[PDB]
Design a protein around this ligand. Structure first.
Ligand SMILES: CCCCCCCCCCCCCCCCCC(=O)OC[C@H](COP(=O)([O-])OCC(O)COP(=O)([O-])OC[C@@H](COC(=O)CCCCCCCCCCCCCCCCC)OC(=O)CCCCCCCCCCCCCCCCC)OC(=O)CCCCCCCCCCCCCCCCC
Ligand SMILES: CCCCCCCCCCCCCCCCC[C@@H](O)O[C@H](CO[C@H](O)CCCCCCCCCCCCCCC)COP(=O)(O)OCC[N+](C)(C)C
Lengths: 175, 122
């Protein structure tokens, strides 16, 4: 339905064929579907309608909490404990958000594989490359930090990678 | 091995110099005083137990005297201890102020410009 955003969780237009009977024999699945409808789907719908009627009389709201952007660990001096603490909290929040992003991409990949059936190897290449890109980024950001991780160790890993890349680029410039 | 016994202007046997009166006295509900009173109560209970008396109810005046004596001594003990720590901090700060060349203020670098070594966990 409209509860979740259709851009974060997209799906194809859901093309379905029309029934084209070829025999005079009656279809038992259609009769069973009608029986199931009349015996299950209508009482459930009525119960849900009553439940929604009761819910409408009591409407209240809950809000999504917004967090300001505080300075990160790069702009904290060596022994400033308060700035370090706030930067570490922000970094942990960002780590959780990145984990959830990877989770969303993985959900997309799983949905594509189930939906495409026998042609998943061809019709899920875009989801696969999206997951490859996000996985590489997440690995570069957070892998091998180990337990007792921190924003300082992430910064050290990033700086080591930057130094290696800069040395490689400089040595390629002389080639 | 003897840090503050030779401090200048130290009267031998006061236990409480006049300069200590510039410090806030400990509150009468200080948790350390409550612990001293609890120690006095335990002493009273042990006194009752040793003399083969009812531990909880035998000597009420004796237990009251125990608690009162412990609290009374602990108040002055806490005053002296706080005064000694105040002297330590005062002398430390004065010495730091008078010797700037041994406690220099060097500019601190931000973590974006300090290079730390990374040790991968694997
Ligand atoms: C860390 C946070 C805080 C923790 C607190 C610290 C630990 C507790 C406090 C320690 C000191 C307090 C008690 C010491 C004096 C008691 C001496 C004694 O023997 O007790 C007998 C006595 C019972 O005897 P009785 O009633 O006269 O009649 C029975 C006969 O006497 C029949 O008696 P009997 O003599 O014929 O029985 C013979 C018995 C006699 O043997 C004993 O009774 C053992 C007594 C050993 C004395 C403890 C050592 C000194 C204190 C050091 C504690 C170290 C703690 C650190 C951890 C290490 C653990 C060892 O011998 C044996 O059976 C052999 C036992 C050998 C086994 C080894 C274990 C023994 C040592 C264990 C000590 C554990 C700590 C004390 C626990 C409480 C003990 C009462 O006990 C009591 O009734 C008094 C206990 C406390 C009651 C007062 C509570 C106040 C009332 C409520 C007011 C609320 C206040 C707050 C207000 C809130 C608003 C509403
Ligand atoms: C098991 C716990 C220890 C118990 C210790 C015995 C407790 C009973 C003692 C009775 C208290 C009265 C003693 C002192 C009162 C007046 C004398 C006073 O003037 O003495 C001054 C000094 O005051 C006393 O020394 C302080 C005694 C306080 C002892 C308590 C400390 C215990 C350590 C922490 C455990 C907490 C104990 C809890 C209390 C029951 C003199 O200063 P000064 O002449 O310049 O120092 C001599 C030593 N120098 C020169 C080498 C430095």
């Amino acid at each position: 339905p409209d509860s979740w955003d259709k851009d974060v969780y997209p799906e194809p237009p859901r093309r379905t064929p029309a029934p084209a009977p070829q025999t005079s024999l009656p279809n038992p699945v259609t009769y069973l579907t009608k029986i199931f409808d009349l015996l299950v789907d209508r009482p459930v719908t009525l119960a849900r309608e009553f439940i929604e009627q009761q819910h409408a009389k009591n409407r209240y709201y809950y809000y999504h909490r917004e967090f300001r952007r505080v300075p990160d660990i790069t702009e904290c001096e060596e022994k400033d404990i308060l700035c370090m603490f706030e930067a570490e909290m922000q970094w942990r929040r960002d780590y959780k958000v990145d984990q959830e992003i990877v989770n969303i991409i993985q959900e997309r990949l799983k949905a594509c594989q189930q939906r495409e059936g026998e042609s998943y190897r061809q019709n899920c290449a875009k989801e696969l490359e999206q997951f490859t890109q996000v996985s590489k980024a997440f690995q570069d950001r957070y892998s091998d930090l180990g337990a007792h991780y921190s924003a300082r160790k992430c910064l050290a890993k990033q700086k080591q990678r930057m130094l290696a890349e800069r040395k490689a680029a400089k040595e390629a410039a002389a080639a | 091995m003897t840090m503050m016994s030779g401090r200048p202007g130290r009267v031998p046997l006061q236990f409480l110099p006049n300069e200590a009166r510039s410090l806030p006295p400990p509150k009468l509900t200080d948790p350390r005083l409550v612990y001293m009173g609890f120690l006095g109560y335990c002493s009273g209970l042990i006194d009752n137990a040793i003399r083969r008396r009812p531990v909880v109810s035998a000597g009420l005046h004796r237990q009251l005297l125990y608690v009162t004596s412990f609290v009374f001594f602990g108040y002055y003990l806490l005053k002296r201890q706080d005064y000694m720590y105040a002297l330590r901090d005062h002398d430390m700060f004065a010495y730091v102020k008078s010797h700037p060349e041994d406690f220099p203020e060097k500019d601190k670098k931000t973590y974006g410009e300090i290079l730390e070594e990374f040790h991968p966990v694997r």
